[PDB]
Design a protein around this ligand. Structure first.
Ligand SMILES: N[C@H](C(=O)O)c1ccc(C(=O)O)c(C(=O)O)c1
Ligand SMILES: [Cl-]
Length: 435
């Protein structure tokens, strides 16, 4: 009940195609953008490597994409499919997953069987530790650099007294913890209160959060690592308690430039500073995804379920066009998905150069690929990918801290590029606006 493509070297995939089900059920509603767009971006990238004669000459890359269902427990059970070769598909490297807690549980099982793992979205500072998850790499920067950026933004505005808000899980708690560590040890940034939002919150919890935050009234700036559904509800609760203009929101990559938490809540979201990793839209994937029909894209097992959710269809004509019959935007992490697959491909190409010299196709010396060796190749990889931007890794397996800084402004509503963070803060304070 998943995507299989035969090939010489088979690469594993982990994507949240469905959201986590309510109470009992494992899998719920289909994630159209966070699931299908990223899944199809891996299939686009793999097809491009097979098309390219220079990268892996007469060597084809295989696909084994599995659904994580937004939860770590389901992804762990799916992860065992990669290791079922040892008492049949042999998996060299796994691309995924999205969520940090999901990627942590996968990293713990893949390290023992010596399988390298490259993520496209997981940003938790815990994953950069080479003791706990030594086979983990990522094409997205760790939250150590985002928390440093947040400290830099706060200090540049003269905001010595702040409060923090976290969502339950690894991404929310450790992201705030990374901010706390930079604040406590270095400089003079004081934390008033660190409030936590539960995973399954009660109907009256978000109103209690605002009331608790108001107990330290001078702490106006709120640094937050909350999910899309959480931010929506905090700002909804803040608007209800007549707290317009009081709170100065600071959001992470989970907030980014999403219109979802700010919609019909434009007044309360005014002047909110957000940080997001440096990113561009790919027209190549856009041309690929728009030309996807139910006839040609039969290899995607979830594409039939996608067609119903996208147009309001029910299996309806079954001859619709994307970006013509329904509103279409390319997902953010798509650049990082393509750059993750190419990072794996370039490392395999570099391993082929060393182990099979003057050879076309796989040599008998590469019949069983060593994961401990291949991991070192991934870290050493340096190339221009997708956007034309360089893709690189350090010793710990992290991408460099390259960020965009946005502010939500009313003039017309937009996320205006007020600055950027690349090792050091470059922030244009002149372009900022408040209520
Ligand atoms: N950086 C966190 C993390 O570490 O999980 C993260 C991961 C994945 C997603 C996503 O699936 O889109 C988001 C998000 O909602 O922006 C945030
Ligand atoms: Cl995930």
């Amino acid at each position: 009940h998943s995507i299989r493509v035969d090939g010489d070297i088979i690469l594993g995939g982990l994507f949240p195609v469905h959201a986590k089900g309510e109470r009992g059920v494992p899998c719920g509603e289909l994630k159209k953008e966070k699931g299908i767009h990223r899944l199809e971006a891996m299939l686009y990238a793999i097809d491009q490597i097979n098309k390219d004669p220079d990268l892996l000459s007469n060597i084809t890359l295989g696909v084994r994409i599995l659904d994580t269902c937004s939860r770590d427990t389901y992804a762990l059970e799916q992860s065992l499919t990669f290791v079922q070769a040892l008492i049949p598909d042999k998996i060299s490297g796994v691309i995924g997953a999205a969520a940090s807690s999901v990627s942590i549980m996968v990293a713990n099982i893949l390290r023992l069987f010596k399988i390298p793992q490259i993520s496209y979205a997981s940003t938790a500072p815990e994953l950069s530790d080479n003791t706990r998850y030594d086979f983990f790499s990522r094409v997205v920067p760790p939250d150590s650099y985002q928390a440093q950026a947040m400290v830099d933004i706060v200090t540049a505005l003269g905001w010595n007294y702040v409060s923090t808000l976290a969502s339950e899980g690894n991404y929310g708690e450790s992201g705030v913890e990374a901010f706390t560590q930079i604040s406590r040890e270095i400089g003079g940034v004081s934390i008033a209160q660190s409030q936590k939002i539960p995973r399954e919150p009660r109907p009256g919890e978000f109103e209690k959060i605002i009331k608790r935050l108001l107990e330290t009234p001078n702490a106006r700036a709120v640094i937050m690592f909350a999910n899309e559904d959480d931010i929506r509800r905090i700002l909804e609760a803040a608007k209800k308690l007549n707290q317009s203009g009081h709170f100065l929101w600071i959001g992470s990559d989970s907030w980014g430039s999403k219109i979802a938490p700010v919609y019909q809540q434009e007044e309360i979201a005014e002047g909110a500073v957000t940080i997001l990793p440096k990113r561009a839209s790919i027209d190549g994937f856009d041309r690929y995804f728009r030309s996807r029909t139910l006839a040609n894209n039969r290899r995607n097992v979830w594409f039939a379920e996608f067609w119903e959710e996208n147009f309001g269809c029910k299996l309806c004509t079954g001859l619709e066009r994307i970006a013509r019959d329904s509103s279409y935007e390319q997902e953010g992490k798509v650049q990082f998905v393509i750059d993750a697959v190419y990072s794996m491909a370039y490392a395999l190409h570099n391993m082929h150069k060393d182990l099979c010299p003057g050879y076309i196709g796989l040599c008998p010396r590469m019949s069983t690929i060593d994961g401990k060796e291949l991991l070192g190749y991934i870290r050493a990889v340096n190339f221009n990918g997708s956007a034309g931007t360089p893709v690189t890794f350090n010793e710990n397996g992290d991408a460099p801290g390259r960020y965009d800084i946005f502010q939500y402004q009313i003039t017309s509503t937009e996320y205006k590029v007020i600055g950027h963070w690349t090792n050091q803060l470059h922030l244009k304070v002149e372009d900022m606006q408040w209520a």
